[PDB]
Amino acid sequence: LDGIDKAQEEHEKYHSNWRAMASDFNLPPVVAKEIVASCDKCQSPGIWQLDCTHLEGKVILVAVHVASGYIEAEVIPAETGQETAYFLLKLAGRWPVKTVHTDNGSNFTSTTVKAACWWAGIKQEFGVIESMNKELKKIIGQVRDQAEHLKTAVQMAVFIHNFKRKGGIGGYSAGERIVDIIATDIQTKELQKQITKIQNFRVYYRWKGPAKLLWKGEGAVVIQDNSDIKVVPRRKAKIIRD
Amino acid sequence: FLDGIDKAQEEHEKYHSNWRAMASDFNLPPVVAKEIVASCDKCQLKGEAMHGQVDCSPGIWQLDCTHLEGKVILVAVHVASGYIEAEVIPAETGQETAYFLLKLAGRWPVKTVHTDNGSNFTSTTVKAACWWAGIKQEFGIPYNPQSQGVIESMNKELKKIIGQVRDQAEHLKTAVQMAVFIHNFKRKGGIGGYSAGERIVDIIATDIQTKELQKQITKIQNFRVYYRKGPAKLLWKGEGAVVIQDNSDIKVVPRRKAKII
Amino acid sequence: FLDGIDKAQEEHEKYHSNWRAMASDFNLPPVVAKEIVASCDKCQLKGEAMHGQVDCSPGIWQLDCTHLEGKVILVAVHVASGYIEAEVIPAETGQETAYFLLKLAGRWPVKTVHTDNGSNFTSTTVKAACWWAGIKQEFGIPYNPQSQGVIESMNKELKKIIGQVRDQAEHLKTAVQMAVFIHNFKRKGGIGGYSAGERIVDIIATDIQTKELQKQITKIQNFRVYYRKGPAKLLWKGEGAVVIQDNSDIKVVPRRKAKII
Amino acid sequence: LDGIDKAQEEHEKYHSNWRAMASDFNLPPVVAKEIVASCDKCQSPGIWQLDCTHLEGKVILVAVHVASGYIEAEVIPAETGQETAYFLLKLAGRWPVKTVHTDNGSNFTSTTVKAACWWAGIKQEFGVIESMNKELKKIIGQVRDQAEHLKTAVQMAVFIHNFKRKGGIGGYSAGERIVDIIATDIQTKELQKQITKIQNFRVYYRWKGPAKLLWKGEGAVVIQDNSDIKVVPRRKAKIIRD
Amino acid sequence: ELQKQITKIQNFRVYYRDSRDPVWKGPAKLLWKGEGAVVIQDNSDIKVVPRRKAKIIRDYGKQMAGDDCV
Amino acid sequence: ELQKQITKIQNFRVYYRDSRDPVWKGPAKLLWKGEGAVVIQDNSDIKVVPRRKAKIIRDYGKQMAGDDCV
Amino acid sequence: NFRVYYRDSRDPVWKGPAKLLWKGEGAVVIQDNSDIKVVPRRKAKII
Amino acid sequence: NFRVYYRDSRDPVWKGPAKLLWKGEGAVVIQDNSDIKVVPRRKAKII
DNA sequence: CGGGAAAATCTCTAGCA
DNA sequence: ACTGCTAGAGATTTTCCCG
DNA sequence: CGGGAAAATCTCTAGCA
DNA sequence: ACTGCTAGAGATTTTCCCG
Ligand SMILES: C[C@@H]1CCO[C@H]2Cn3cc(C(=O)NCc4ccc(F)cc4F)c(=O)c(O)c3C(=O)N12
Ligand SMILES: C[C@@H]1CCO[C@H]2Cn3cc(C(=O)NCc4ccc(F)cc4F)c(=O)c(O)c3C(=O)N12
Ligand SMILES: [Mg+2]
Ligand SMILES: [Mg+2]
Ligand SMILES: [Mg+2]
Ligand SMILES: [Mg+2]
Ligand SMILES: [Zn+2]
Ligand SMILES: [Zn+2]
């Protein structure tokens, strides 16, 4: 508390995201989110791309996490709807898959894949994928000598790409990047859930009119009144539901 | 306490009386009666009543096979989080286990796998797979399923879920994947009120973040401490207590008798 | 709380999410999420975590068969005392069980016998034997060995003792009788620090003595009490508390609001 | 305490047993036992009788608890040492058998019976048994029509005799009598055990010479000094082992 | 007369259990013994325990110890 | 600089166990994380827990609840 | 009223709902499909 | 020294005495008849 | 500070076969 | 030298909320 | 009243198959 | 309308004993 004005000034002078203001000034994320949302002027993690490539006369189904570059690939006996549905069901069970982007191939348009997406609650919409396939083929060629079957080589290539290839802004691997992105998405979901929980109530302070509730503390209550954020003690404030 | 001891010893050799009976019937103190019982091999038939604790490090997975409708299901669980992976395999063999394990190692940072001594887990093929993927292999004490207690428990959980959703799928493999999904994302509880998926994400991200933060702190902060001996290395000072390390030994001491240089 | 409920119900029908997951993912209060879970038959797969308690009345014996070296051992235990009787029988049949039971009933006051639903215990011959000896028969819930816990435990104990003395006898029947002796007279502990034989003697003698004393007291003492309802019968008065019986119900009341006539 | 003189006077005027003095005047059994044993002028439970009877060309082994009249009878295939040894082992396992009296028959003198008596710690020494056999035959005849085999009739007769035949000083059954006798024997054994445990210590009170220890209570110590029993406060008494 | 019998009946020790706890409660004092209930005193507390949950003994070692004496 | 990183590393929560108790001890605070040991603070008590007995998370719900704030 | 779901006898499959006729210390008596059964409370859940 | 008696592996018969080479949190390493074995402390008794 | 509902923590079980 | 655990069903104990 | 050994009570497990 | 228990291995807590 007693830092909301500093947060507003810093937002005006930098237009920083709510995370920066919450961390630097040590404010609850709800308060910072309300502050950033108020200024009108200043106003992905679950998306995957599916494709089928061919190598050595065998079909490899490849899934790319667009935001991270994290790859999951499998050799499938045939390029059929059943195999794609099973692969997608596995992926959904192992990662929070929200949307899948395909290329209108018959297997992806099959009713089996539609059923799998419906049960898993996944949305389907018909150059990252091609470059990814190119790099996967490169790694498979590099490691083809250490294996005996194509599927083992494909899994080794997935391992190398996801955890042994480092490069980018911070020099992290795809696995670390996807873990970080999913963690951030969980943070965002929790923030939204608590905003939903809190926004259903109203606060009367000192008696003034109804005001939006933002945060409840041990001995302090942070509220918003006509685009103005204020701190009031609990004894002086009454919280109700309407 | 000599003739009583002799009579008690003969009585025990015949009947193996417990220490209370001998103490009562031969005017013996409890200590000597207990010594009589303890010196008899034939009366040592019970282990100490306790349980150990399995390793729960962020990099350990527990693997096991289970059976359902005449088919083999390979199951792995991330111990720290309870996050499971599973799949039907045609045969309970080392090749399928090694393929499963290479898949797992390419999708999560598997540092160690802990399993029972089933033939598939002890095969040379799985050993080669672990060697390639940089995975350490730990085997529990034979015929001690408690050593794999986590994954065994998950075998019970997965099967349960499989029974809840068996009518939504024609094939058992689809039901297995459905149950994996349900467990990893649709069941919340335990540490943090998380689901297993969010819990594993949090655990791995926390591992990376804390590693980086501690590395930066060590790079910036460097000091030596003398406490009630050698020049130990400080780790955290505050609240009137100082934590130091001296020859791979971490000790917490009060602020008194501790100088920081 | 009506929009979230429908989505939670659909999500549950597909996945059978537990109440925590639904409360988290659909902004639901715990009560409504729990109601969703409770209204689903497919999610009721666990009984309440507790144990009952077996009858321990002075007249109840628990009987069971056990197997050792391809031979059948019939075992009875006096529940209140832990006093056991046992013997090898050639066949696990109703005739031998009834002979054993008539023998037991002629040596101790067996009022009731509690057993599992093994065929020998449900035979008409054993029923006739119990009818002649004035013995009430109780059968546990089928395939619930816990209902016979005591005797089951004693089976384990008996076998253990047999293993300790099996080399002192040539025949298994002799070893069984040796183990019965050892348990009944050479093992002390439990209630009163007794052996099982001493404990059963004390239990039975106390039963007779207390019965006679209470009968004499009732013959000598007779009074009526009014508390708060009717002329209850006093049982024990003193220490600022009165115990009364009314309509076959026993009540303990403070000395206040209680008049003795 | 403060009743030793009354106990001594009661013993002098009646020479009653220690149980009566302990119960009437509420004294520890050790003190009453010491009092009764002091006067020189005033200075079985585990005994069994074995026999073999014959009926309908079958051998019935009968054991009688002499003190109580409680019977244990079985039909044995042959009057052999092995059968007798097994019967004796069972009896010893079920009751505290200390001694058995037999009629010098070959089975009772067999090495098998000697081994059984040695393992069970039973002592063998070679008009109650005959009368009990007659009563057993009478009961068997009374109930012979209710059974089909002789062994069942024998067990029914044992039941009737032990628990359904009442008669004597108090109209008690044989089972009740044996339970009472064995309970009294346990009482006696425990009294002897505590006397043995306590006799190994000496007491110095107020400092006088060593004195026999009889009872160590919570606030007093009852001792004996030259055929005189006295009570001493705990502080004024010291107990040692010689 | 009556007092002696009452004291004798109160010399007996009772070990019992509560409806939901498996461990046996220590040696309470016996006050009244009925067909299906036993009224006991356990540290100045008067409890009615069902017959099927009570083991009633006259611990003979304690009786010979004189612990029943004042 | 250093203070910010120390506060961040102290924002993490630790659930641990003792050598003989199977239940997991509640969310203690993290002070130091080593290769084989974690030094935590649990109600003004500083404990060294072996690595194999500690689960370290940044509980995101509580982080978004603002509980870390003074 | 009460709904009871129970594990019957050596059958790992849970059944119910069944009416709760009676509740004891360690067991219950229920009626499922016009059939009366006795189940340990360990093997039953009442709602 | 220590005498250890243990239940080895699916064999209900207790063995020993064996020398206690090492004692851990939930297991012990022992030597019986010149053979090294690893046993859970649940399945061992040390004297 | 006083009660009551709610939330949290505690106790205990089967099944993993 | 390695090691029972998991998640659900009730029970009981704090904790928050309006006077 | 102060410590230490002993006794008692408490906690927990396998096996009953 | 019926029902886990037993006995042993350590752990921990009272209780007694001499100053
Ligand atoms: C041939 C492989 C290798 C050698 O051992 C066997 C037998 N076995 C037995 C069980 C088992 O008895 N589970 C029940 C159980 C009991 C107690 C507990 F704490 C946990 C539990 F799971 C397994 O789970 C299991 O996987 C195996 C197995 O794989 N094998
Ligand atoms: C054919 C009869 C009639 C129908 O039931 C079967 C099977 N049964 C099984 C066990 C058993 O599983 N014991 C292990 C156990 C497990 C838990 C527990 F608390 C106590 C325990 F004894 C028995 O003891 C037993 O006697 C029988 C038996 O006799 N029968
Ligand atoms: Mg296995
Ligand atoms: Mg297994
Ligand atoms: Mg049976
Ligand atoms: Mg049985
Ligand atoms: Zn022995
Ligand atoms: Zn459901």
Author numbering:
A (entry chain K), D (entry chain B): 2 to 44, 57 to 139, 149 to 228, 235 to 270
B (entry chain I), C (entry chain A): 1 to 228, 236 to 268
E (entry chain C), F (entry chain L): 212 to 281
G (entry chain D), H (entry chain M): 222 to 268
Copied sentences from the primary study:
We have assembled HIV-1 intasomes in the presence of excess IN C-terminal domain protein, which was readily incorporated into the intasomes. The purified intasomes were largely homogeneous and exhibited minimal stacking tendencies. After CTF refinement and Bayesian polishing, the CIC map was refined to 2.01 Å, a resolution that readily accompanied the building of an atomic model. DTG, Mg2+, and water molecules coordinated in the DDE active site were also unambiguously modeled. We were able to build an atomic model of the CTD tail of distal IN protomers up until residue 281 with the high-resolution cryo-EM map. The distal CTD and its tail resided within the intasome core, and the tails were largely buried within the assembly. At the current resolution, we could readily discern that the C-terminal tail engages in a number of interactions with other IN protomers within the intasome. Tyr271 and Tyr194 (Chain A) maintained a hydrophobic pocket; Lys273 was oriented for potential interaction with vDNA (Chain F) through long-range electrostatic effects; and Gln274 and Gln209 (Chain B) formed a hydrogen bond. Asp279 and Arg269 (Chain C) formed a salt bridge, stabilizing the tail alpha helix structure. Whereas full-length IN normally donates both proximal and distal CTD dimers, we conclude that the flanking dimer domains can be substituted by the CTDs added in trans.
